[PDB]
Design a protein around this ligand. Structure first.
Ligand code: HAS
Ligand code: HEM
Ligand code: CUA
Ligand SMILES: [Cu+2]
Ligand SMILES: [Xe]
Ligand SMILES: [Xe]
Ligand SMILES: [Xe]
Lengths: 33, 555, 166
């Protein structure tokens, strides 16, 4: 049919989770640096 | 007494792998809850010591948890799935002599190693890091157990070569392609552990030598030690790409995307191991950086996959009357556990991935290394996705193998088991990732020092809750698996049913792409040069300066 | 439909891919950054430094715990620590603030971990090898060292201490 809008939604959720986790821990690294 | 065993004797062989596999999962998993509580600051062990008088310490439990679940269950599942599936797809028979040789090797190898483990002679954990020296029969047992896969590699190479011969110039079928680069990847990978075992562990525990170099021991270990998690993952991926879209009422939306994913796993799976050794001395920081980058690359296959499966599930969902941006999620068959189990597992796989990508970033590792975070990371990965997929697959594979149908009572029991296992695993993950941010070390009997980590107050509540939820789940699962394996209900016709393989949307651009990827001989050579380029420089330098140390028993 | 869906998907797929690499390369950059800063100090010494684990505590830098600390620069202090079956030497390690402490750690028996709560000091300690890490404590005080690698039956109980004097 058209643009896989729900696939996008899934990979978007994934991308945000990757960022919250990564930046999140990148934060703590310096906080312990 | 089954003809179905006689044109498909490969069915029986496959059942025995699975049975042995799920038994290991049950025995292993019993220690699960006790360990979850341990991390909840509750000491359950005198209770378990009373049920199981043979259990001597927390650490023997953990060794049994690790080995039977992550080494035994997963390897037996792989062997069943990555031999049988490529067999049913080519509609050929696996060399049956060899197949049964690999089952016995695995069965004898397990039994040989089971003894010292059960007799508390090898409380070394599934990583078995020297100098901690385990009984010789553990090392030999595992050796043979792992060597069983070498027969499987062969069997499936054979099957592939024989299909090549009968179809000159045709593109390897998808599942087979997956299985083929699967077992080749595993072969390249397996050399590390095999070298450690043949060079150090076996002679050592036979006494032939007195010392082992810990740094090379674990450097070689993590050579195999990482690809082995992909050796766990890919059998689940094979199922998700080529059987789940059908169970979801849609199609795999891209053949060559699925090929590319598995190709990249052959390529980047092995030369990354230093990501397990970020905290090790004597390995150059450059080489670590290199490997940290190759590890982010190894993440790409799972990023690609994340889209492809989602597309197919949304495709499946729309076909099912998928409404708007989220309507297709509700449109799926949430009444079928064969579908529910893997999809849920894929959810848990999202936090799972971010944790791993964190872990892989060299310097960020030092935050979490060896803390309760890592157990957080991998229960979302192996004990969720892989396990749930496997459990779920009971709902279709088991009928196809045995001809026993599945009752509605059972199909509903499964949905309970699956949802609980998922919820239990989620709850724990938060407990362990949390606890891990608070410095709670992993591989520790922390209930035995109740006052050490008071700052993990609330995560400990979660870890406790998870232990209860997962114990229930486990009991219900044992119940339901045995109910299916203990009924005499046999329709031999559903046993002769085809596997619910899913069809694939093909495009024009496929051909040339797919063709290039079917160049298996070339890609394998590239795979191997990478390993030499990634490991070679370091391995030579460590081998130049061997410093063996005597063994120790401290349990 | 379906064949339409194939082009759309494969398009959006290349997009996602390119965006993902781009995002990985951003992480590659930021890690490269920490490698260049003061905080890259917790990264273990690259060099092989072999020692005998059966003589570490009869002869050498780790013999006498009263020789453990040794000022080696204008603001640099080498601390020779010994992680052994169920404890650390010296206990406590006593160090100054705002000095660059160079830890040189080893084991006479099995593998242990050296995890300095509150810090990025997280190194594995291997019998027959010296694990060398640098770190400048800024916050003063009572740091507790935790063994985070299974070492035996009393592992859960192998703690140590750092006393960074104000
Ligand atoms: C099979 C099981 C495992 C998988 C999979 C796995 C993935 C990764 N791991 Fe790992 N791991 C590390 C790095 C990674 C990286 C970069 C990945 C990547 O492959 C992960 C990529 C995954 C993703 C990028 C997620 C993709 C998400 C998908 C595909 C789902 C989408 C959902 C959908 C589509 C469903 C939507 C559904 C609807 C209904 C809408 C590192 C460091 O770099 C350590 C060392 C920690 C330390 O310090 O000791 C480590 C530690 C471990 C250990 C402990 C070993 C030990 O005891 O010492 C185990 C057992 C393990 C297993 C596994 N690990 N890992
Ligand atoms: C019954 C459900 C389960 C629960 C409640 C559970 C819980 C836990 C916990 C809390 C730990 C940390 C223990 C420690 O570090 O000392 C652990 C370790 C581990 N578990 Fe599980 N788990 C379960 C099932 C599984 C499954 C299905 C697998 C693999 C398929 C698995 C593989 C592992 C591995 C590899 C470790 C680490 C062992 C080690 O560090 O040597 N577990 N488990
Ligand atoms: Cu030393 Cu655990
Ligand atoms: Cu890994
Ligand atoms: Xe084993
Ligand atoms: Xe082994
Ligand atoms: Xe592993």
């Amino acid at each position: 049919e058209e643009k896989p809008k729900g696939a996008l939604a899934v990979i978007l959720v994934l991308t945000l989770t990757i960022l919250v986790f990564w930046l999140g821990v990148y934060a703590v690294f310096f906080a312990r640096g | 007494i089954s003809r179905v065993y006689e044109a498909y004797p490969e069915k029986k062989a496959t059942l025995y792998f699975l049975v042995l596999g799920f038994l290991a999962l049950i025995v292993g998993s019993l220690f699960g809850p006790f360990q979850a509580l341990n991390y909840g600051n509750v000491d359950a062990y005198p209770l378990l010591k009373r049920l199981l008088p043979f259990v001597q310490s927390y650490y023997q439990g953990l060794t049994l948890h690790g080995v039977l679940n992550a080494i035994v269950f997963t390897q037996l599942f792989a062997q069943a799935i990555m031999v049988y599936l490529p067999a049913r797809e080519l509609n050929m028979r696996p060399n049956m002599g060899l197949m049964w040789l690999s089952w016995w090797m695995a069965f004898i190898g397990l039994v040989v190693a089971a003894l010292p483990l059960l007799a508390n002679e090898a409380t070394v954990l599934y990583t078995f890091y020297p100098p901690l020296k385990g009984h010789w029969a553990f090392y030999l047992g595992a050796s043979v157990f792992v060597l069983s896969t070498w027969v499987s590699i062969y069997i499936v190479l054979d099957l592939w070569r024989r299909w090549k011969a009968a179809n000159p110039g045709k593109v390897t079928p998808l599942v087979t392609y997956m299985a083929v680069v699967f077992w080749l990847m595993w072969f390249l990978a397996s050399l590390g552990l095999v070298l450690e075992a043949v060079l150090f562990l076996l002679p050592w525990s036979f006494g032939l030598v007195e010392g082992v170099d810990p740094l090379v021991a674990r450097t070689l270990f993590w050579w195999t030690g990482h690809p082995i998690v992909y050796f766990w993952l890919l059998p689940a991926y094979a199922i998700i790409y080529t059987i789940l879209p059908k169970q979801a009422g849609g199609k795999l939306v891209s053949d060559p995307m699925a090929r590319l994913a598995f190709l990249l796993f052959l390529l980047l799976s092995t030369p990354v191991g230093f990501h397990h050794q970020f905290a090790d001395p004597g390995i150059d920081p450059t080489w670590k950086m290199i490997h940290s980058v190759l590890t982010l690359f190894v993440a790409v296959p799972s990023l690609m996959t994340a889209f492809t499966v989602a597309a197919s599930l949304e495709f499946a969902g729309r076909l099912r009357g998928g409404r708007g941006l989220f309507g297709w999620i509700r449109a799926l068959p949430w009444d079928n556990p064969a579908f529910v189990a893997p999809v849920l597992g894929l959810l848990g796989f999202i936090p799972g991935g971010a944790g791993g990508i964190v872990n892989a970033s060299f310097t960020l590792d030092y935050v979490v290394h060896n803390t309760a975070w890592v157990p957080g990371h991998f229960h979302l990965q192996v004990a969720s996705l892989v396990t749930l997929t496997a459990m779920g697959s009971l709902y279709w594979l088991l009928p196809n193998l045995t001809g026993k149908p599945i009752s509605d009572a059972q199909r509903r029991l499964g949905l309970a088991v699956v949802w609980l296992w998922f919820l239990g695993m989620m709850i724990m993950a938060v407990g362990l990732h949390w606890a891990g941010l608070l410095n709670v070390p992993r591989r520790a009997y922390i209930a035995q020092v109740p006052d050490a980590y008071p700052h993990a107050a609330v995560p400990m509540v979660f870890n406790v809750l998870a232990g209860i939820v997962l114990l229930v789940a486990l009991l219900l699962f044992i119940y339901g698996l045995f109910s299916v394996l203990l009924s005499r209900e046999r329709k031999p016709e559903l046993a002769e049913a085809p596997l619910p393989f899913a069809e694939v949307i093909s495009g024009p651009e496929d051909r040339r792409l797919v063709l290039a990827m079917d160049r298996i001989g070339f890609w394998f050579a590239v795979a191997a040069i990478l390993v030499v380029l990634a490991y070679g420089p370091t391995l030579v330098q460590l081998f130049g300066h061997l410093n063996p140390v005597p063994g120790w028993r401290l349990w | 439909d379906e064949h339409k869906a194939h082009k759309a998907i494969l398009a959006y797929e290349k997009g996602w891919l390119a965006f993902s690499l781009a995002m990985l390369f951003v992480f590659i950059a930021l890690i490269a950054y920490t490698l260049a800063t003061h905080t890259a100090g917790v990264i273990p010494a690259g060099k092989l430094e072999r020692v005998d684990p059966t003589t570490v505590r009869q002869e050498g830098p780790w013999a006498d715990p009263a020789q453990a600390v040794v000022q080696t620069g204008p603001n640099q202090y080498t601390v020779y620590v010994l992680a052994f079956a169920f404890g650390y030497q010296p206990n406590p390690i006593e160090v100054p603030q705002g000095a660059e402490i160079v830890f040189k750690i080893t084991s006479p028996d099995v593998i242990h971990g050296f995890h300095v709560e509150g810090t990025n000091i997280n190194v594995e300690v291997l019998p027959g090898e010296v694990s060398t890490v640098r770190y400048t404590f800024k916050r003063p005080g009572e740091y507790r060292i935790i063994c985070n690698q299974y070492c035996g039956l009393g592992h859960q109980n192998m703690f140590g201490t750092i006393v960074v004097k104000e």
